[PDB]
């Protein structure tokens, strides 16, 4: 079937290589793409090539690359390989791009995902030269049907001087109808509109991105796959974490602090999220609802069994197996899923109104329960804050989940002081590791520290943590949040110098 | 003219001492009180005295004290002296209470002010045994008219098992009409209601707090004063700061990034605010609107000079001169001011929708523009995060303002690394000191550093910050946000060891 159903736009179809020539050195480029789904593929590959060729001849060729969130090898990967990106925002998971960022070759700022559209409209990223957006289809009246994510595509389409569309025949035609795109003022000039979402299954818009066809400078016909990350099978650490979390939910229900259907759930991806979604599928709950950033394997399974009734997200993040399953049953799952603009999926007004339960990963937390989601040793970027801030602060309950150690035991995920902070104490109420669960509601910092050390810290590190804390309590400038500034960051430096946070017994250590 | 206009409730009047006896060791007490305005006074004093006596006889006698925000000597002060508060939330400015907190004798957690009502309903502080609320009057229908703040009072009245009302004759009877108390589910069980505020001057509720009269166990007639802000004027440092900000706003308007009337303004608690407001009072921006937590002296003046049209807040924080001024002209000012529940004034959904400009003070910022609002040397509580987070993260523009130094030049307000973080990089776009303004929008952390160091840092400290940053760029573990962890916190330790951040 013909995917470009607007006859007039067919005249703008052309090869990827030619379309990529529309993108000039210094251009700010907004693209589709969120958790490895729905990013443009062929134009970025052709761009990277021409970039490398330019560079080889001593000619500068770099762009500013603003996305929904993370993309995949064909975009972030190819462009970072070509060294073709001078500035990147707001979220990346590609390893080559991460190396450019951590070497200072690509300037990076990881804005809260729900705020990116707003800040783009305010002009923070400068003037948008190009919007580059992947589509399932173009409708009879020139509407752009998105693919496996919505992200910021509508905002980029509004702002950009020129538009390039990739129509990807790999994406299932029955994605059409799954998106909800609102024409209301979510991220524009104040006063903004009330986003009137009062239930997770509510649609407020329509199925297409809107763009003036006169801005469309090229359409490229493509056929290439998203980045479908291998399924991260839960290990015993992930299963233990999930166990403690599910025990906690069951307890809150039995104490009437949560309904039996819990509240709208936001979860991440990976090992632990997968263990939690598997536990929810088997637990004593019913009629669950997702209001998250992403749809993952475990959510599909609950939508299939009827355990989950609806899942709202901005994107899919599926394994190949799960992708195949939803592709063969898009008719059924399309009725269970709403994909929203990320400035709506990550809207704090909505997250709070709905009372979402936030469940997020972390690099580390300190004994007072300040959380680092991004910067290893305080200076090396992992991925970015993403929407963890959007959700942690706005949620009914903010839960952080992590192995108690990293790097094969050589790093403790509970430290004296976090080397960088993404989520302040006030934005984190519950911590879960494979060692147990700390409930910090209503506690002072010293009381948080007693719970976090006793419930969450690994036994190999707990005596060092207790020693730091005990001595801080005796010696800190103030006793409200006790610290020893002489050693607060010394475990990290110890790791930098020696590859482990564990002390050597050839020198003294108070514990 | 009788303040208690419900005849039947007059039979509940009793002595402050007798009322205090309703409050038992271990109780959770929610009170009125926000920025030194509208907190109960007599029952706390009577309680404090009974607490000391009990301690002497060997009887434990402490409470949990949950407020709107800060109170004053009659409440926080007296209970601190008596050592009668085991836990305190969310915001304190009383010196005696601060000393209990920093000595570890009172447990404190400074929640975001807009979230306190919600967490209290959730059960985070435990069950509320008592709500102790100051009132201007009690209407014929049994409505409780608030005094100089709303705070969390509606929520505490809802939650508490027993209610004590102090009716304070000192408070102006013409406060009645000024408050807007919403019927809706703002902070209750999800799903919450949409709060239909789309304009800062929009009233959506009524003038009184609602409470079941069967829950009222005692009404205490009182007569005692709120705290006042000092009467003290902006010095050359604050005026320099206001000058840079006002120039910034001017450039924004000229570039069409702000309207000529700007956007609703949130002005933080502090003295740099006064400079800023005093600057706006005679600035080129007309038809201004406040959507804030508090009505300061500055705001009152603009409401007077017509330069500001309306101000929404949860509370008053006025000098005695300004207090006298508004109490002479309440009929004028009452039409210009709306006092709301703090979970409405500080609602992130509302703040974002209105597109507030947030202007807040700070202890320090690091060179990457993380902000500390609360904890000196990372461990010693000043006041609390208050509503600075609610507004910083939700605002259209998040501005932080500060002298570039503290303690007569012996502390730099710009440091290699903040000893504690309240506001992350993502929540701070603009910094202003008396040295200049740093516009960080669209910038990576190293780019932020270059702006903050060059524009904001004091000349005494700027070469030292540049030295730290340059060696970090060379030697840091990663280069995205360069640090030398062996010296990131060394300026703070140097201050602890020697009394100054300047090397010998
Ligand atoms: C959609 C949800 C909202 N978005 C976000 O929260 C985005 C920010 N969060 C993230 O990027 C991830 O949650 C985190 C923080 C990287 C953790 O991811 P995860 O739960 O898959 O954790 P995992 O144990 O597999 O480790 C992830 C990587 O970080 C590394 N890592 C984790 N903790 C670490 C630590 N304390 N020190 C050093 N490396 C660490 C680990 O070695 C691996 O590489
Ligand atoms: C909205 N609500 C909020 O933002 C709540 C949190 N914020 C606050 O409490 C205040 O904005 C702050 C952060 C305390 C700053 O207040 P302000 O603008 O009045 O600042 P100001 O220049 O007057 O300094 C206020 C006090 O903090 C002290 N201070 C300020 N910066 C400091 C620093 N870097 N190190 C140590 N003390 C510092 C200063 O000495 C003074 O206390 P003392 O007189 O010495 O007892
Ligand atoms: Cl809204
Ligand atoms: Cl809490
Ligand atoms: Cl709302
Ligand atoms: Cl920005």
Q: After which residues is chain A broken (C to N over 2.5 A)?
A: none
Alpha-carbon distance B35 to B270, whole Å? 11
User: Please, are residues B232 and B323 in contact by the beta-carbon 8 Å criterion?
Assistant: no
What does the alpha-carbon distance between residue B503 and residue B493 come to, in Å, rounded to a whole number? 12
Burial class, B334, CB count within 10 angstroms (exposed 0-12 / middle 13-18 / buried 19+): middle
Report the C-alpha gap between A390 and A59 in whole angstroms: 40
- Residue A309 DSSP SS3: strand
Say which residue the tokens 């280069």 belong to.
Answer: B479
If one counts every other C-beta atom within 10 angstroms of the C-beta of residue B306, the result is 11
Q: Which two tokens stand for residue A169?
A: 């025949």
* Distance separating alpha carbons of residues B403 and B241, to the nearest angstrom: 8
Contact B36, B317 (CB under 8 A): yes
**CA of A327, closest CA in chain B: separation in Å?**
33
Q: Residues near ligand 2 with C-beta < 6 Å?
A: B 268-272, 360-364, 373, 376, 382-383, 386-388, 403, 406-407, 411, 413
Helix (H) or strand (E) holding A254: helix A236-254
What DSSP assignment string belongs to B173-189? GGGTTSEEB--S-SSSS
How far does chain A reach from its first CA to its final CA, in angstroms? 71
The CA dihedral of B26, B32, B35, B41, to the nearest 10 degrees, is -80
| Alpha helices, DSSP H, located in A380-510 | 388-394, 445-451, 462-475, 490-498
Tell me which residue has tokens 């925000």: B69
Q: Kindly list the residues from chain B whose CB atom is less than 8 angstroms away from the CB atom of residue A444.
A: 87, 107-109
Q: Where do runs of H (alpha helix) occur along A57-200?
A: 78-81, 95-102, 116-122, 153-159
- Angle between the N-to-C axes of helices B271-281 and B297-305, in degrees from 0 to 180, rounded to the nearest 10: 10
Regarding the beta carbon of A383 and ligand 1, being less than 6 Å apart is answered yes
User: Measured between alpha carbons, how far is B452 from B498 in angstroms, rounded to an integer?
Assistant: 26
* C-alpha A128: how far from chain center: 23
- Determine contact, residues A55/A21, Cβ cutoff 8 Å: no
B286 vs B145: CA distance, rounded Å:
33
CA B147/CA B38 separation, integer angstroms = 5
Resolution given for this structure, in angstroms: 2.1
Look at residue A144 and give its three-state secondary structure.
Answer: strand
Taking phi first (over 0 means left), then psi (-120 to 50 degrees means alpha), and beta for anything else, what does residue B131 get? Answer: beta
Cβ of A293 less than 6 Å from ligand 1: yes
Which residues of A are tagged catalytic? 293
Rounded Cα distance, A361 and A373, in Å: 7
Pairing of strands B371-372, B375-376: unpaired
Set of chain B residues whose Cβ sits within 8 Å of the Cβ of A111 = 426
Are A374 and A101 in contact by the 8 Å Cβ rule? The answer is: no
Q: How far apart are the C-alpha atoms of B154 and B208, rounded to whole Å? A: 9
Distances (CA, A) of A138 to A9, A150, B410: 9, 15, 64
- Give the H/E segment covering residue B446: helix B445-451
Residue with tokens 């005295």: B49
**CB neighbours of residue A161 within 10 Å:** 13
Strand bridging mode B137-138 / B144-145: antiparallel
Tokens of B379: 């461990």
Q: How many CB pairs under 8 A join A and B?
A: 232
Which 8-state DSSP code applies to residue A192? P
For residues B242 and B99, give the distance between their C-alpha atoms in angstroms, rounded to a whole number: 32
Please list the alpha-helical segments (H only) found in B375-419: 388-394
Contact A375 B123 (CB under 8 A): no
> Catalytic: B293?
yes
Q: Do B442 and A124 touch (CB under 8 A)?
A: yes
Token digits of residue A11: 């005249």
What's the A103 CA to ligand 2 centre distance in angstroms? 37
- Say how far residue B57 (Cα) sits from the centre of its chain: 38
Note residues around ion ligand 3 (Cβ under 5 angstroms). Answer: A 194-195, 349; B 349
Q: Is B208 helix (H, G, I), strand (E, B) or coil?
A: coil
Q: B-chain residues within 8 Å CB-CB of A481? A: 375, 378-379, 381, 420
Binding site membership of A232 for ligand 1 (Cβ less than 6 Å): no
CB A118 within 8 A of CB B353: no
């Amino acid at each position: 079937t013909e995917r470009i159903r607007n006859v007039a736009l067919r005249s703008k179809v052309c090869p990827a290589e030619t379309a990529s020539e529309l993108i000039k050195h210094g251009d700010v480029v907004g693209t589709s793409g969120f958790t490895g789904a729905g990013y443009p593929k062929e134009v970025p590959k052709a761009l990277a090539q021409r970039m490398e060729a330019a560079h080889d001849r001593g000619e500068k060729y770099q762009i500013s690359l603003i996305t929904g969130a993370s993309t995949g090898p064909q975009l972030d990967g190819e462009l970072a390989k070509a060294n073709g990106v001078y500035f990147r925002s707001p979220f990346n998971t590609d390893a080559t791009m991460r190396n450019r960022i951590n070497a200072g070759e690509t300037e990076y700022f990881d804005n809260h995902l729900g705020q990116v559209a707003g800040r783009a409209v305010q002009g923070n990223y400068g003037k948008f030269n190009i919007a580059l957006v992947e589509a399932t289809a173009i409708t009879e009246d020139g509407g752009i049907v998105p693919t496996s994510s919505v992200g910021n595509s509508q905002t980029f389409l509004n702002l950009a001087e020129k538009v390039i569309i990739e129509v990807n025949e790999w994406q299932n035609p029955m994605l059409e109808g799954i998106h909800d795109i609102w024409d209301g003022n979510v991220s524009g000039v104040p006063t903004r509109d009330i986003v009137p979402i009062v239930r997770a299954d509510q649609r407020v818009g329509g199925p297409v991105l809107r763009v003036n066809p006169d801005k469309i400078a090229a359409i490229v016909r493509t056929n290439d796959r998203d980045r479908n990350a291998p399924f991260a099978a839960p290990d015993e650490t992930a299963k233990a974490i999930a166990g403690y979390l599910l025990d906690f939910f069951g307890h809150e229900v039995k104490q009437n602090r949560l309904p039996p259907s819990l509240l709208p759930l936001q979860s991440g991806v990976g090992n632990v999220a997968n263990a939690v979604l598997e536990g929810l599928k088997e637990g004593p709950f019913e009629n669950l609802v997702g209001y998250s950033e992403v749809i993952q394997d475990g959510m599909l399974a609950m939508l299939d069994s009827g355990r989950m009734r609806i899942a709202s997200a901005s994107s899919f993040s599926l394994s190949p197996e799960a992708a195949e399953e939803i592709n063969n049953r898009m008719d059924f799952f399309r009725s269970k899923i709403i994909l929203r603009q990320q400035d709506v999926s990550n809207s704090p007004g909505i997250i709070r109104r709905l009372g979402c339960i936030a469940m997020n990963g972390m690099i580390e937390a300190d004994i007072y329960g300040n959380v680092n989601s991004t910067r290893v040793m305080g200076s090396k970027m992992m991925n970015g804050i993403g929407g963890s801030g959007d959700f942690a602060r706005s949620s009914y309950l903010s839960i952080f989940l992590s192995p108690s150690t990293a790097k094969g035991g050589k790093i403790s995920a509970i430290v004296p002081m976090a080397a960088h902070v993404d989520h302040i104490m006030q934005d984190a109420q519950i911590f879960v590791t494979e060692q147990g669960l700390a409930d910090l509601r209503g506690l002072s910092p010293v009381q948080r520290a007693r719970e976090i050390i006793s419930k969450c810290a690994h036994p190999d590190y707990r005596p060092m943590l207790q020693d730091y804390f005990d001595r801080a309590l005796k010696n800190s400038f103030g006793k409200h949040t006790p610290h020893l500034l002489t050693e607060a960051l010394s475990w990290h430096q110890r790791f930098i110098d020696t590859g482990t946070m564990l002390p050597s017994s050839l020198e003294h250590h108070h514990h």
